[PDB]
Design a protein around this ligand. Structure first.
Ligand SMILES: Cc1cc2nc3c(=O)[nH]c(=O)nc-3n(C[C@H](O)[C@H](O)[C@H](O)COP(=O)(O)OP(=O)(O)OC[C@H]3O[C@@H](n4cnc5c(N)ncnc54)[C@H](O)[C@@H]3O)c2cc1C
Ligand SMILES: Cc1cc2nc3c(=O)[nH]c(=O)nc-3n(C[C@H](O)[C@H](O)[C@H](O)COP(=O)(O)OP(=O)(O)OC[C@H]3O[C@@H](n4cnc5c(N)ncnc54)[C@H](O)[C@@H]3O)c2cc1C
Lengths: 343, 374, 346, 379
């Protein structure tokens, strides 16, 4: 199992990290910690570097770095805490849909169950509420469930029965008998190992890996400067040990996130089916556990703008469960694994 | 061992519950509850509570109390939080600053300063932490240079709560500097309007904001030095030890677990995935309630067991943090959009949670205290 | 609430503690860590102190001490690591049944699911397997389930279809269509708040509390004598902090176990009364696992050998933590009761 | 990067797998598996593994190896445990004592000692820990006082595994007492048959027992002090860091998770277990990658203590968590019937406490990780 580094990804990451270090970070301690949606302040950096063509393969005139490039982009966006202007477009692009839409509804499991599509009259209607990753009054891509079938549905703004929950963060969209046709179905969201859903989960897992890594960096540095009882905080075992444990989880998360992207790219070019679930569920738990520990290690300053941790703290609140609760993702992964042990 | 309350206690408790549920108090509570990063003025609410005689029932009558036992005041504290009253001001004014004055103040200082606190007309913050002295409180640098009979105060206090709404500050200062780390420390009750005081806000992720307090030769009367001069370090930790019960965190965890159950029950049914957590948290809540009253029964008899107090603080604050983290994921997207009342308190709970294992002694300090019982 | 110690019980604990310290402990590192069953080596000391009469009321000829005394006995039995000759005869006595049998089948939730009783003409037929708390080849008290009704069945030592697995510990009983009649039913095993199951759960919670407590006692003691890098183990934050966390869990467990015992006793004389036995059991099962893992780490390799005596509590928690059901499963039962109370409130 | 293995690596794996699935091997594996507190003799199995040339495929051919890359020996180690081979004798003899003579031994000592190890004819164990020297290994008081060009060793070594079955003991001794804590220390390859050696068992809850080794003026030839005299302390640390991969714990966790799935699968329909199965299978996936991350680097001369400590910690802790959970999975009938899964998981529970203590404790792994926080090349 060769794990030595690839130059092409190394350049990509270096160019993202340098470019994103310029992006201005939102200065509040309340309200949204980032500007989300396809048109955030990091959108400019991504466009310059041609992020639209990263996952594009050798065929059809694309860079040819596969999902792994998408995972690298998402990790650096999370690390910078500058917002994610990439995930919604990259989901749309993987299905041939035009950009510009917020995506919503991934938090429910089974996939799409927060917005149910009922066959009624001579039609179908969407009913439920969903969390959005972008502006809730714009166009939407909704994970919806029709008769047990998980589907991604395009909804144009101002549609009947659609109300936008603006002002809470993340934003929320509500559907009261919002009508849809089979023409609005952008694609299916099944568990195929290389489908749009699996790619979407690995991008989100990489984002959570970035957010968690970014918070750890702050705590490790602040524990190196701050002194109490004439010792660096980092020389206190009750501080160093939790930061070290957070390091293990970050490296364990890196391992399954990149393994997941590599398996997907190998299939485009055994335990393959649950790799996206695995990557997302351990990243969501890792982000939650790393952030708790970082807040405690940095004391009351972690809750104030003296540090910068408050941005990652607010992000983990909204992002750790955006694509499903870890406990539920694990049960899906465990069911699949127990299936294999039965046949 | 009686795991439960007498009939006399529950008659008291239900009277206090009724007093807290009049239309006037409910209106004041609603105008005063912090949410969405906002920290409203609650002085009008606290005056209503003072007028009803509920702020310091355990204090002597000469100071505005009712001379009830400490356990009657825990009943009141529990019912205060269960009625929606924001309790940070009560904890800081009555349970820390007021308690210190009763424990270490002269009969004059108690007369001159305590009655307004018991009536809800004046309030006090706690000004110990300094930029270089958090867990290591003995590294404080604020100096109290004598000035005739009085003193002037220079230093910086940071991370206190409610300070821009309060009138008094309990301040730790070096009266005799250079006499050692844990020597020559004194406690002063500082008027926050006095010259040279600069209160300002450090933004905090939570609803209630932190504060920086600036003392530039702040003049303080000699009668405003509480307790024996230069004996502040043993007095200060004696007082912190008496205030440690875990009850305040128990009631947060209770409020937050009940809010999550309300959110769950306000949405159409079995909720199979939440059942284990609801069970464990309810069980740990019951353990935490007993651990808190284990401290109060001991305090009421006049014995201060610092290990037991440290157990209760650790268990309740870690429990309250765990409940806040899990409960914040329970309201559905529709409930967040519509600002269901439980979604609002749970959003606040999440952003309060990190502080619980840090205030009034960190989790790590509690474990250190606990290690002395070996 | 007032939690000052009861003087009559402080004496009762002291008397149990010193008499149980006179019972030799099993000397091996392999095999069963205790000899339990109704007549193991600590039966004499319990008989001498009249423990069999602690719970029965004064009017029935007992000492009227209640389930609280039963909990004290069980905790002190767990701390001693001398085996448990109380639990099965207390369960039987709470149902008017004479003693001497091993109790089995508690590990299955819902109650009795590991032994299903299917209706026959003159009774039922039992099929399943079950963990016993005593000799699997003796008389038995089996938690079984007839059509969703949980019941306790008395089974004679050589009943047909009954196979005793005595190789393992804890020992196991298998039934292959073993036949029982309505006369063999000792009593129902319902979820009633002061019912036999609820008392049996509280006794098991107390037993786990004593096991964890005994284990923690020896790790704290060892951490005080063992030195490395010229400091006491207890003076190294990485060892002392896990030992201090275990103490928190032990105190939390003591709180719910004695709250539950006192609430059952209250209702026997005179919010969430129904779930208290589950709360106590589930906290004690998780506390025992968490405490013992921490004690083993804090003492190093010696924890794994007869240099310390931790190894007896270690094997005990392996068997006892789940003998009355998995904690997550107990917690879900507690959770549904709480959520159902919340659905009613709205 | 490339997750997964070369087609050439998969072909070599399949031949190892087939070689370990013969009647001769499976019969011997059955006879040598520790279970129920009994630790059987393994010498016959390991003779047979040496005959098959599987014990040290990456050693030089002069010394019994087959001149293969280190990653090829990792593939063998994987398939040895997946075929039931008890591996502690292999880890102590080939992966610790054997690796250390390769790294620090002369031609004279390499040639006299290595071949019988590669053939499974002779075995060694590690004699470092003392009654007052566990974590604080520099507190060791064993003394090697000179005797001509040889030495006489007096001390007490405790908590080694397999010792009453082995021939050689890698023993740390002070060749110069009074030289300061971490100075004056040398390593000896002690012949455990020599006069003055008394080996006895310290009973432990695990299947495999601990040992006490008493050394009373035991003679040690001068050509058996391996490495530079008195430079023993650095050599032990270098050897330990090179040894640390997490592969051995990864394989215990994989065995135990698979035993628990076997137990569950052979039983009626488990919503309780699904989450544990999921998290444990994902953490195993992460742990396989971390382990092979350190082997890849070791294969390329790169030594990196922090990544090796991460892998050791993650894998040992996971194996403990898997053993604790999975011990409750077999139901009473399976325990009564001695379902092989139940036997394996009963062993696993009693083994688990040692994993976060052997070859560096979990606390020392965290200390090594904090080392990264003071490095400028952190990111
Ligand atoms: C909600 C809240 C309210 C507060 N209110 C007030 C107030 O009213 N008045 C006031 O004066 N102050 C107040 N404070 C300040 C508070 O007392 C400090 O946060 C606290 O003393 C710890 O300081 P710190 O946050 O700087 O942590 P640091 O001292 O920087 O410590 C950082 C981390 O290291 C750990 N640590 C530190 N030393 C050790 C050690 N020796 N061993 C092991 N671990 C160690 C700590 O536990 C913590 O996790 C408040 C804080 C909070 C969070
Ligand atoms: C399965 C197994 C196999 C072994 N095989 C061998 C062998 O072949 N040869 C051999 O020589 N030895 C062997 N050992 C011994 C092993 O190396 C020791 O267990 C270990 O080196 C020292 O731990 P200890 O048990 O003495 O614990 P202690 O040193 O008493 O430590 C007690 C606890 O405190 C922690 N601790 C100690 N010091 C510190 C510190 N400064 N900071 C933080 N935490 C600290 C430890 O991590 C541990 O958790 C084996 C042990 C095991 C479990």
């Amino acid at each position: 199992m060769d794990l030595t580094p690839d130059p092409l990804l190394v350049q990509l990451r270096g160019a993202l990290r340098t470019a994103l270090a310029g992006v201005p970070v939102r200065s509040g301690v309340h309200g949204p910690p980032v500007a989300d949606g396809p048109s955030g302040p990091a959108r400019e950096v991504l466009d310059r570097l041609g992020a639209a063509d990263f996952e594009r393969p050798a065929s059809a005139g694309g860079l040819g770095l596969g999902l792994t490039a998408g995972v690298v982009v998402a990790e650096e966006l999370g690390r910078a805490a500058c917002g994610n202007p990439y995930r919604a477009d990259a989901l749309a692009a993987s299905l041939g849909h035009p950009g510009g839409a917020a995506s919503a509804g991934w938090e429910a499991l089974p996939v799409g169950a927060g917005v149910t599509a009922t066959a009624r009259a001579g039609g179908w209607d969407l009913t439920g509420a969903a969390t959005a990753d972008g502006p809730a009054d714009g166009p939407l891509l909704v994970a919806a469930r029709a008769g047990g079938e998980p589907l991604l549905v395009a909804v144009e703004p101002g549609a009947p029965g659609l109300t936008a929950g603006t002002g809470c963060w993340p934003q929320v969209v509500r559907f009261e008998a919002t009508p849809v046709t089979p023409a609005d179905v952008v694609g299916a969201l099944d568990d195929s190992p290389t489908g749009p859903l699996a790619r979407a989960r690995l991008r989100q897992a990489a984002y959570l890996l970035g957010v968690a890594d970014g918070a750890h960096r702050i705590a490790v540095r602040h524990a190196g400067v701050r002194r109490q009882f004439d010792t660096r905080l980092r020389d206190l075992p009750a501080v160093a040990f939790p930061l070290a444990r957070a390091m293990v989880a970050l490296r364990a998360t890196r391992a399954v996130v990149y393994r997941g992207a590599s398996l997907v790219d190998s299939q485009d070019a055994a335990g393959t089916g649950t790799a996206p679930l695995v990557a997302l569920a351990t990243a969501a738990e890792t982000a939650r556990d790393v952030v708790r520990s970082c807040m405690q290690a940095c004391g009351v300053r972690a809750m104030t703008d003296e540090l910068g941790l408050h941005r990652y703290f607010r992000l983990v609140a909204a992002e750790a469960g955006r694509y499903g609760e870890p406990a539920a993702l694990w049960r899906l992964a465990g069911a699949a694994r127990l299936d294999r042990a039965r046949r | 061992m009686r795991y439960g309350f007498t009939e006399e206690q529950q008659r008291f408790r239900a009277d206090v519950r009724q007093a807290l549920r009049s239309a006037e108090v409910r209106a004041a509570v609603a105008d005063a509850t912090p949410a969405d990063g906002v920290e409203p003025d609650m002085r009008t609410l606290y005056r209503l509570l003072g007028k009803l005689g509920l702020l310091a029932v355990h204090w002597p009558a000469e100071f505005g109390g009712a001379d009830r036992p400490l356990t009657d005041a825990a009943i009141v504290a529990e019912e205060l939080v269960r009625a929606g009253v924001p309790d940070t001001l009560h904890v800081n004014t009555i349970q820390i600053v007021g308690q210190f004055l009763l424990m270490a103040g002269s009969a004059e200082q108690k007369r001159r300063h305590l009655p307004a606190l018991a009536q809800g007309e004046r309030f006090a913050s706690v000004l110990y932490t300094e930029p270089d002295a958090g867990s290591d409180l003995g590294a404080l640098r604020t100096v109290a240079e004598p000035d005739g009979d009085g003193y002037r105060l220079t230093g910086t206090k940071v991370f206190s709560l409610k300070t821009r709404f309060v009138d008094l500050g309990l301040c730790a200062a070096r009266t005799t500097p250079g006499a050692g780390k844990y020597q020559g420390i004194s406690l002063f009750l500082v008027d926050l309007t006095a010259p040279g005081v600069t209160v300002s806000v450090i933004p905090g992720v939570s609803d209630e904001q932190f504060h920086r307090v600036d003392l530039d030769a702040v003049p303080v009367s000699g009668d405003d030095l509480i307790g024996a001069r230069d004996q502040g370090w043993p007095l200060l930790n004696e007082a912190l030890a008496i205030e440690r019960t875990g009850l305040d965190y128990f009631l947060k965890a209770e409020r937050w677990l009940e809010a999550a159950l309300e959110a769950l029950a306000d949405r159409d049914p079995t909720h199979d995935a939440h059942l284990e957590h609801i069970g464990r948290f309810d069980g740990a809540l019951a353990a935490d309630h007993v651990l808190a009253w284990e401290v109060l029964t001991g305090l009421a008899s006049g014995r201060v067991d610092p290990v037991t107090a440290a157990v209760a603080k650790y268990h309740s604050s870690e429990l309250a943090r765990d409940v806040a983290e899990w409960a914040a994921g329970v309201p559905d997207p529709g409930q967040r959009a519509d600002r269901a009342p439980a979604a609002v308190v749970l959003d606040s709970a999440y952003r309060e949670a990190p502080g619980l294992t840090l205030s009034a002694g960190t989790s790590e300090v509690m474990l250190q205290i606990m290690a002395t019982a070996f």
